[PDB]
Write an enzyme that holds these catalytic residues in place. Structure first.
Site, short mmCIF file in Angstrom:
data_model
loop_
_atom_site.label_atom_id
_atom_site.label_comp_id
_atom_site.label_asym_id
_atom_site.label_seq_id
_atom_site.Cartn_x
_atom_site.Cartn_y
_atom_site.Cartn_z
N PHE A 32 0.87 -1.28 0.03
CA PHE A 32 0.12 -0.12 0.13
C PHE A 32 0.82 1.18 0.04
CE2 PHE A 32 -0.77 -1.48 4.64
CZ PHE A 32 0.10 -0.52 5.09
N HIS A 76 -2.28 -1.39 14.67
CA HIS A 76 -1.88 -2.28 15.71
C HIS A 76 -0.91 -3.19 15.79
CE1 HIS A 76 -5.51 -5.13 16.20
NE2 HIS A 76 -4.80 -5.20 14.80
N1 LIG Z 1 2.88 -3.49 3.09
C1 LIG Z 1 1.35 -3.70 3.09
N2 LIG Z 1 0.45 -3.54 2.01
C2 LIG Z 1 -0.69 -3.97 1.88
N3 LIG Z 1 -1.32 -4.54 2.83
C3 LIG Z 1 -0.83 -4.91 3.83
C4 LIG Z 1 0.53 -4.74 4.02
N4 LIG Z 1 1.32 -5.33 5.03
C5 LIG Z 1 -0.05 -5.96 5.88
N5 LIG Z 1 -1.11 -5.94 5.09
C6 LIG Z 1 -2.36 -6.29 5.28
O1 LIG Z 1 -2.93 -5.74 6.46
C7 LIG Z 1 -3.70 -6.63 6.87
C8 LIG Z 1 -4.04 -6.66 8.52
S1 LIG Z 1 -5.39 -7.54 9.14
C9 LIG Z 1 -6.73 -6.43 9.04
C10 LIG Z 1 -7.54 -6.56 7.80
C11 LIG Z 1 -8.68 -5.83 7.40
N6 LIG Z 1 -8.36 -4.32 7.66
C12 LIG Z 1 -9.56 -6.21 8.53
O2 LIG Z 1 -9.81 -5.46 9.56
O3 LIG Z 1 -10.27 -7.28 8.47
C13 LIG Z 1 -3.39 -8.04 6.24
O4 LIG Z 1 -4.73 -8.46 5.58
C14 LIG Z 1 -2.55 -7.84 5.47
O5 LIG Z 1 -2.73 -8.34 4.16
#
Ligand SMILES: Nc1ncnc2c1ncn2[C@@H]1O[C@H](CSCC[C@H](N)C(=O)O)[C@@H](O)[C@H]1O
Ligand SMILES: Nc1ncnc2c1ncn2[C@@H]1O[C@H](CSCC[C@H](N)C(=O)O)[C@@H](O)[C@H]1O
Ligand SMILES: Nc1ncnc2c1ncn2[C@@H]1O[C@H](CSCC[C@H](N)C(=O)O)[C@@H](O)[C@H]1O
Ligand SMILES: Nc1ncnc2c1ncn2[C@@H]1O[C@H](CSCC[C@H](N)C(=O)O)[C@@H](O)[C@H]1O
Ligand SMILES: [Ca+2]
Ligand SMILES: [Ca+2]
Ligand SMILES: [Ca+2]
Ligand SMILES: [Ca+2]
Lengths: 339, 339, 339, 339
Positions: free
Chosen positions: B231, B249
């Site tokens: 992202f 978190h």
């Molecule tokens: N560098 C990065 N770019 C994009 N997504 C990422 C990332 N690092 C972690 N994530 C994503 O962050 C998420 C954290 S879990 C939370 C997922 C969602 N917002 C919910 O509330 O259900 C995971 O799905 C993981 O794929």
């Protein structure tokens, strides 16, 4: 309906979180937190400095523990204090819970549980697949592992020892042999209680030396011979009473019969064997069943009912004379004679 | 007196045995026992055959679980039945506890907890030292681990999605971006509730495609773009509202600031950021603190209070506007503007 | 005559050997023998190994102590056991006798007694001549020495604290000052009992920091000022009540007057001073006279009668109003006003 | 339980204060108080002036001593009087207790006890570590120390001399050698009771001359040769009987063997050696073990049983011929011949 389902979900989630509650206790004892709180409250800062812990993380750990009743969070000045629950974690060779907490803290103990599925698929120990060696081999080779286990078994044994010595009339016996007698607290208690008795403690060579230290320092070296050995190969012949406590539940049926048959061979017609172990009855307590599951994981053992023991005794040329209560819990004394 | 110490000891012992209680549930779910009990009671024999378990050992496991309330032991004919607590463990993508139990069953999950002491000593995730890889790398390389995680997170999200969509007035927003929006349930709920809204979801490539499935399956494919990737690269400039739920978190303070600064540069002067996450207040529940510790273990993260987030936002060019309740746990929606 | 003389000689010889009996206890306590006997009888050999003692010599020591009733010599297997007198020596911060024994074990404590003849010839402390430094200087520089003194004092002052707080009505006072208040036990008890009161604890700098830790731990840091200082130079001005407990008996007449005179000038016309100390008459108990001799030896001090205090107070422009009971011991409260 | 624990605590405290009681006696004899009360009661004021004491402080000491039975405190007009216990403290070279009290008054005697812990840790004398010199060296170089010691030894010896002379038949002997014979009271008593006997006294040079004075005054100067020497080097050979009283208990096993080999070499095959010393038997008196401990503290010595002496003698080419009682107490005469 909905509220009922939500309550069930919360109840089950608490169970899952219970794993982390236990591990937090393991880390608290591994770091030595309870010992540092014996002279009044201390700050997370000070506790972190003394234990070599990361300050912010120890604070998180201590807050969590206090929230579930272990240690008190004073709620001011970053202070934490000993409480009733944290106090039982103070290191003490006579405390089952304190020694067990430190035993369980070991990574290889926790890792055997990692592979519980393996045991549930096989009826065998997961310890080997998890750790690359057997529980008995690890405790044989590794003095730290041996010490953690022998302390945890030894604390339990200290309590049971007095109970056994009070629950069975040894007055008719001149000689006793404790087979796989650990650090020797059972033999020590029985010898103390019955001055005319003499004994032999049979154990794995390293453990036998620990028993020698305990028995000698309690002034019993001239009344108890130490026999380093292997109960699959050797049982001293011709004693009046043989004792075997928390040993048979480590072993599968085949191995129990091997042990029993060698004991039977060593027995005189008038000899008695006391199998002292946890017996499964009609409604076992959860705790009794938890220990049964621990036996599975560590050594592929299992607790048995009296009828299960009786069947193995029959295949070994032995028979149950009677079974006696022994303090609280599931422990019973099964008195056995040759058929 | 000594009666109080006895109770203290039993309480702590119950905590220790709770780790094993958790692991027994992990095994029951890994084997898939609950789903076999949906058409009436079944014998341990039949359940063991269906799951590939050792009959007598599964019987022990089920007996134990039933004594602590999970499954019903009928007490005859080897029969076990579903009960209120075990029903909670049925496979169902909308069930937080069922999906989390199966996630926790994974050996690498339990193994992270094996090395909790490392986290307490360092402030860093134990996952990496326990498993030889980071949590993120593992879920990138192993589609089974990925699936376990995405399901565990997706179930929780399904509940939250409707709560958020109902707590926050999204009317007047043309575009919304969900940063690391998992399987897209949050985006789906908000789009449903606000027909004017167009959306963009950012996620790692594998779950991005899973989000595409969920959104497409709900007839929202035309109203939401899916941008797979990191992202940091994909975060679109000029959206009306940015959402970030249970992402921050996962990260330590400095990494959170890095993410926040990146979002700030993308925000128009009148944009809003919604940080949706668990907030620590002055009365955090035990379960809230347990999740905080899990975050540390798995990914090196932590739960934060509002003022803690406020300090990070003020290092990032952002300001708290409002903090809205969301559901009945510690979840809050923190509404944020660019300074 | 011949027999009576022999008896008198034996009585006096017993007195002389009593010094060695005392030192033997000091060594037993310093080595930690009583702690090692709480789990039942142990051999001199094992006790020697555990304490770092020379085996043959510890055996001699224990055998001797047993012949005079301290520990039990079982008379077989080299065993020694705890008995009623040795149990008194267990390390307990709440035990005056146990903490005092450890305090007396210090070589610098015994060495002060070496020069008793100097004290009897001059009226001055023997501590300084023997040790090359004063008791206050030693405890200022040596935190190990100070700690021994602390534990010995604390074991009593903790009980005395609650007694004073229950024996005098501080309900009318806004401010209190404890002059030489030790680790602050007295101030803490009084502040607990009288929520409207504020305090100031005046102590030697190293001790003041000890008091800070105690009062902070008691949640009283916001209600008590910590004042590192010297009561021969500084007394906080204008408090309603001043307290001085077990301080004045440390000092000779001219030093007492110096202290009292600074207190007088800090007092408002309506202020009260409470002198809290052992008030003797002209035929005290042996133990009380023994403590008076210890005061001479350690610090050149003495116990006094109310009249003697009055004489010194009148010399300091202070006036006894009345005296009050507290603690059913020699300890009383003398309430004093500006003359 | 409540009363019993307080009883025990008081008893132990009394033991502790017993060290100060002993020191108070030391000061009283050092100052020479008892000799001033032989012609009636005197005031503290007069006693202080006569002894060069500080009036107020001597009054404290005497009042304390009287409360525990030493001197009578008349309880009016500041008067004190001799009593049965203080009377035995009168200076008298024939009084063991009076001379011992004055010997113990020495600061270097008390200081050896200061380092008792060292002895218990090492099995070595604490005297050297405490005083920077050995007991033998100090008494060689310091005439005052030598006199205190020789007087304390000499009083005991006077009481024993007549006993030895009357308990062993010296009739068949023409020559006798007293090895380390102190001031010669033994040799004198034996020469008196056996007219045909001729004696040699071996002692350290300064001591030898004091022996000469005693033996000359007894009219035995022409019957006893005075031999200044070192018994690790020189033993006159060819005597009929060798005597060694209260010497061997000064020395450790190796050093006793050294002395014995010297004596063995000097003896004719039909000679006798009389080892006259305190023998440890079944259930030794407390006072016997107190002296054993003093030997350790002062010179690194110990009291022995006959069996222990026999072991050393055997290593030295000697053998016990018979053991004879000597007076009332632990002293015995061990008659020895060449193996
Ligand atoms: N560098 C990065 N770019 C994009 N997504 C990422 C990332 N690092 C972690 N994530 C994503 O962050 C998420 C954290 S879990 C939370 C997922 C969602 N917002 C919910 O509330 O259900 C995971 O799905 C993981 O794929
Ligand atoms: N082959 C073998 N021969 C002898 N002892 C063995 C053995 N295999 C295991 N053991 C011992 O079996 C014991 C089981 S634990 C029980 C110890 C003791 N009886 C008590 O009740 O406290 C361990 O001490 C272990 O050392
Ligand atoms: N010059 C000085 N100024 C301030 N305090 C002093 C001092 N000299 C000694 N003290 C303190 O006087 C105290 C005597 S002991 C009594 C302590 C306390 N009041 C109690 O009752 O327990 C010691 O704590 C010592 O630190
Ligand atoms: N190396 C040495 N040579 C000769 N005498 C020694 C000695 N070391 C110590 N002594 C003497 O050994 C004596 C021990 S005290 C016993 C003295 C005497 N036999 C009696 O019973 O009264 C002392 O008098 C001391 O002078
Ligand atoms: Ca006596
Ligand atoms: Ca014995
Ligand atoms: Ca003075
Ligand atoms: Ca009185």
């Amino acid at each position: 309906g909905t509220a009922a389902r939500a309550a069930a979900e919360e109840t089950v989630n608490d169970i899952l979180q219970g794993a982390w509650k236990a591990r937090a206790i393991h880390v608290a004892v591994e770091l030595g937190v309870p010992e540092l709180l014996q002279e009044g409250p201390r700050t997370a800062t000070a506790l972190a400095e003394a234990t070599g812990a990361h300050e912010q993380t120890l604070r998180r750990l201590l807050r969590l523990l206090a929230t579930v009743g272990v240690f008190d969070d004073l709620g001011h000045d970053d202070l934490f204090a000993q409480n009733a629950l944290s106090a039982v974690l103070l290191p003490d060779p006579a405390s089952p819970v304190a020694t067990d907490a430190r035993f369980q803290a070991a990574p290889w103990h926790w890792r055997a549980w990692e592979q519980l599925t393996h045991s549930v698929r096989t009826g065998e120990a997961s310890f080997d697949v998890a750790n690359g060696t057997s529980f008995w081999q690890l405790t044989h080779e590794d003095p730290k592992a041996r010490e953690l286990f022998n302390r945890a078994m030894g604390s339990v044994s200290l309590t049971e020892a007095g109970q056994v010595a009070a629950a069975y009339d040894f007055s008719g016996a001149a000689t006793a042999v404790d087979i796989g007698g650990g650090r020797g607290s059972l033999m020590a208690a029985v010898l103390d209680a019955f001055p005319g008795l003499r004994g032999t403690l049979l154990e794995r060579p390293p453990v036998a030396e620990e028993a020698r230290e305990l028995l000698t320092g309690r002034g019993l070296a001239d009344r108890c011979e130490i026999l380093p050995g292997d109960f699959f190969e050797t049982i001293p012949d011709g004693a009046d009473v043989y004792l075997i406590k928390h040993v048979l539940h480590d072993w599968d049926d085949d191995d129990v019969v091997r042990i029993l048959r060698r004991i039977a061979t060593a027995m005189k017609p008038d000899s008695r064997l006391l199998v002292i172990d946890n017996l499964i009855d009609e409604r076992p307590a959860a705790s009794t069943l938890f220990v049964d599951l621990l036996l599975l994981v560590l050594v592929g053992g299992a607790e048995r009912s009296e009828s299960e023991f009786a069947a193995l005794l029959e295949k070994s040329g032995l028979r149950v004379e009677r079974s006696l209560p022994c303090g609280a819990g599931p422990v019973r004394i099964v008195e056995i004679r040759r058929a």
